[PDB]
Amino acid sequence: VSGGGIKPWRQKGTGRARAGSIRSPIWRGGGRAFAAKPQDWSQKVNRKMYRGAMQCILAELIRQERLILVEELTISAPKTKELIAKLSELNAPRALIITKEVDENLYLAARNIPHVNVLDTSEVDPVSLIAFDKVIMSVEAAKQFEEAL
Amino acid sequence: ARVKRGVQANRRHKKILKRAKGYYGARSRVYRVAVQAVTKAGQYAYRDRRNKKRTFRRLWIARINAGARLNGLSYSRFINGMKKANITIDRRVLADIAMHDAATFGALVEKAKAEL
Amino acid sequence: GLRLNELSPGVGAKKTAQRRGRGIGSGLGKTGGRGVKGQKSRSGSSIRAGFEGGQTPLYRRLPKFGFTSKMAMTTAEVRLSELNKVEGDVISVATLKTANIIRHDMKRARIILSGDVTKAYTFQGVKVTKGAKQAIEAAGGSIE
RNA sequence: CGCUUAACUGCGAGACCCACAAGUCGAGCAGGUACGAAAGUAGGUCUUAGUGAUCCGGUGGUUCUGUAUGGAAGGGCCAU
RNA sequence: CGGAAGAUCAAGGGUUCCAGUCCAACGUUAAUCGGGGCUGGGUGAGUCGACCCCUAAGGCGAGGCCGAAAGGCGUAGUCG
RNA sequence: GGCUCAAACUAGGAGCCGAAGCUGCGGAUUUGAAACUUGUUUUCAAGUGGUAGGGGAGCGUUGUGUAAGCCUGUGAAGGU
RNA sequence: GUCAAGUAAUGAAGCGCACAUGGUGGAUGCCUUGGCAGUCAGAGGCGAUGAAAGACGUGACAGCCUGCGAUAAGCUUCGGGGAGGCGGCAAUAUCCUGUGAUCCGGAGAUUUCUGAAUGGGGAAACCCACUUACCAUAAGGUAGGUAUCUUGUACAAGAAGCGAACGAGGGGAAGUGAAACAUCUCAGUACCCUUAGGAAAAGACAUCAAAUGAGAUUCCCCAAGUAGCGGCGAGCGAACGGGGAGAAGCCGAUUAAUGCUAAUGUAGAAGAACAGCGUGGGAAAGCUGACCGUAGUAGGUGAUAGUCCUGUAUUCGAAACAUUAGCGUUAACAUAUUAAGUAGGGCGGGACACGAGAAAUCCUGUCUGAAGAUGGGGGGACCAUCCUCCAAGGCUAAAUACUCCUGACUGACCGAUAGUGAACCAGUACCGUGAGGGAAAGGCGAAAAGAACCCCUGUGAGGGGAGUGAAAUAGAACCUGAAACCGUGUGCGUACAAGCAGUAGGAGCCUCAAUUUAUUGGGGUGACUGCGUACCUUUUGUAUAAUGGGUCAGCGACUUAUAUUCUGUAGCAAGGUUAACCGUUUAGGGGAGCCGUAGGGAAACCGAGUCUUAAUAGGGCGUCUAG
């Protein structure tokens, strides 16, 4: 804190509580006793722990009928309406689409739909599999998880 | 995540002051004096909750003593008479009979008086 | 998982941390378990490893003894039960290094009788104990 | 009084005492003796005081180590 | 009161000077009053003082000397 | 206060008062004990004053996800 | 009816409690124009062509702030843009503007005085000059020149000073720790001083190594809190080597200009799609039905909006001037030729993790002093052998350090006692001779619609009407409006009674709701009775006449990073796990390393054994899994 280097008054005689700085944590405008600093919050998950969690989540997704397997999910044009209509016939208006080699026009189609995301199998996180109401995984992408888990 | 304690402190202090209503002066107005008045009131209540049972038995015994002495013997001989006659009536009920129905207590003393 | 709501730590996994000086009911009010006025109750107190309050500490009433050998820090002992990490049949110093059995800076190795081998091995430049030698050749191994 | 060196070496089951560090007693075993004709006795003195840790430095020994290697210096171990 | 409590300055201050107007705050009370607020005005020099020329103490000081660096000293001078 | 064949003292006797002690009635709780068995249930037994201090179980507050949810001008937060 | 005796009720100067209603005050809640920490990029300077900081001016308009400089809220030009505008408090007036204003970007011109300040001086914003050319004739004007030092031939070119951190270098504490203190530590730190660049330094072996050898410097993870050093105390603390980042070696890898070529940057432009009804002051919220989406979690708009506005996704413009890169040219500097007062030595010191130690190696104040490839340095005293490398010439990018700054973006960062000292005219007011220290202080309302007029008053303050507004105890000290504290009203109690002011009882009175009508229940009060010496701290022990607190509100004290040990839980399990890094980045790769799986001994060494011993005896320490 700025300033506060000198003793505000002599130790004895004045009748006031002894003080050593006007920037004491007891004083208004004083420093913070145990002031916060930037810190790292990332933890270590063991490689097998991360793999095991994704195995547990995918297995649970099947058990509660939240995984949807499709042969392929491609869009002819980068149109939001086309994918919104394809999700309706798939009975998943809000879902997480997982495919290998996410298309450059399927990305744009889903980039506006509110509760919809399209991810590569190699950039799927444990939170995404749980947050979304359904998961539409292609058969090709399901094989990737079969090998990587 | 700074936490400001003003709201919780306000209703916490208000809770103590609400419990100090009717107290004189600072004991019902300023928290520092009211908090130890509320604690002291609770200490008195806990002890006076034992003393109540202790004080009403003194009241019953004195009422019974007056009733027995009105017609015949004393309390010390009355309780002995009831004990020998296997009469289980508590001192609470006896003091109520003495103070509210003197005919029954007169008949009740006779049963104790014939037993000694 | 079901949802981000019903994800629980599996009771016993988490324990509440202790906060000192938060009132009478918490069990740590007014002192933090520090006791009363004393050196160990003060802000910067410590136990000071190696101190008995003034009498010469135990590590100074006793004498220093021995010397450190540089050979001992480059000689690794190898167990019979660790040999399953070796690729192939030869067991040498360089072969123990690529199996991550011994440190890369170890110069020589010794094979002792701890577990039991499962396949025939050929030991070239490593010393083998008498008990380990008979266990090696009982599985068809050799020492050269 | 005669002869002597057990005022040994390696130890020591088991205990006493004891915060620790220390301290105390100890049969028995192996080796080498001293005295006795021998069974034996002897690991100082009737016992309980006569004492001072570690560090550091010195000395007598020792294959233990020995900064490329052979040495050596230095260090370690045992005794003081 | 009147060797000031009257006048002229220097220092210091800076508009407190004069007029009109207002009275909330300021004035240890009231205030129509004020060194208060607001709005205008007011300080005219060849001769008074400064500036200017000159120097004292003392500074700074081409070159010079000294000093790890920073700098210290010092001549001619230049300020004061 | 007052008390003298006591309301004093000695030696006896019988009543009674007298505590948060004991019992009676209701309820909670720790530990252990037979089982639909993780508080799934009915009980039983022994416990439950407490500083320093050790152990266990929770409440509330600010912020993050849950949450493009849910509530809210038919009235949020805050205050009373 | 008269007397006597006995005994009620009634009072309130004031006070207590409860409630109702205000004042003060400015908590809380909500809010933000301000901060705090970062990420990815860029840049890393300004100045004698006069800087940074100022002083004084400058407008139709008095002050301050902002801009600007006597061409003075500004002038010229080149671009953009298309209807308002002459900066803010903060309006008014004169006006300007499609003959394109204001406004934004590029360039230019002007640019008072002080300040390195540089013509001399000086108490900064002032005083006094000399000189050249021209003009005027009076007592001047206009345009220049005139500091000092350094490098070149009395002539040209530079420098100066200021400003964040990071670098290099010259000097260099003490508080502290060692439970004292002197060696030592703190620490080569704080501080002082010199000086550079976008980085700096270092850098190619007179280096390690001792293996099967490697191959400059720098930085990160390990090695390892190991080996060592150490009043062998407190502490200090490597290296070899392994895994990475980056890689480069040369004899000019220099600097500064100029011209082409390419790409940025500094203004910009377009940019989809919603209606009805009900509530409401107001619709964005409700209900019904549509539409856009490469644009759906942006900020606003009278309450919460993808379709109202500004925006967003997407596609793009540059007359001008910087910037980056490639080519060419020009001129300044540099261009060693293998290294003698050198290596080594004595003395005294310093640096090496290493405190003289058995002390190698590096530096040097003093005194000395080689060999010079048939040679020399090193391999931790020293000698021999072997290996390695050639000092006494100069350079060299990257990986690394940092933030006065510019842009984009982010936050389990703050939200007005917080966050910067500073959200506000803050480094201000104020304090100090000075160096220096250093505050307080945000919010009407959606829109000022900021209350015409009337009334009381002094043409004052203040208020009441009227009016505006959804709201006016939202009225400018203005959102909400807590507590302390101070009033007013109502009910009850209280003027014969002794004390932590309550508590357990309890009569009476007052007030509400039921009830067939004083019977209960709720609320207020508390005559009278019993009991009862605050709280905290510190103590053997406190009502203590021991400490602390006038009260209220707000703030105020066990944290964070790393190492390690134990416990729980989870994954794997005789195995477990990667670190730095790479990565299109929580994935995946990376096995270097660490722990476990074996101990004994000082060690060599041996190993379910091992040590001691002459001993195979005895004994010590181990053995017969879970990490």
Short mmCIF file of C-alpha atoms (C1' of nucleotides) in Angstrom, two decimals, chain G residues 21-23 473 485-487:
data_model
loop_
_atom_site.label_atom_id
_atom_site.label_comp_id
_atom_site.label_asym_id
_atom_site.label_seq_id
_atom_site.Cartn_x
_atom_site.Cartn_y
_atom_site.Cartn_z
"C1'" U G 21 -45.18 8.34 14.15
"C1'" G G 22 -41.05 11.39 12.99
"C1'" G G 23 -35.91 13.78 13.08
"C1'" U G 473 -41.67 11.32 3.55
"C1'" C G 485 -28.85 9.23 19.43
"C1'" C G 486 -33.04 12.88 19.96
"C1'" G G 487 -38.41 14.24 20.00
#
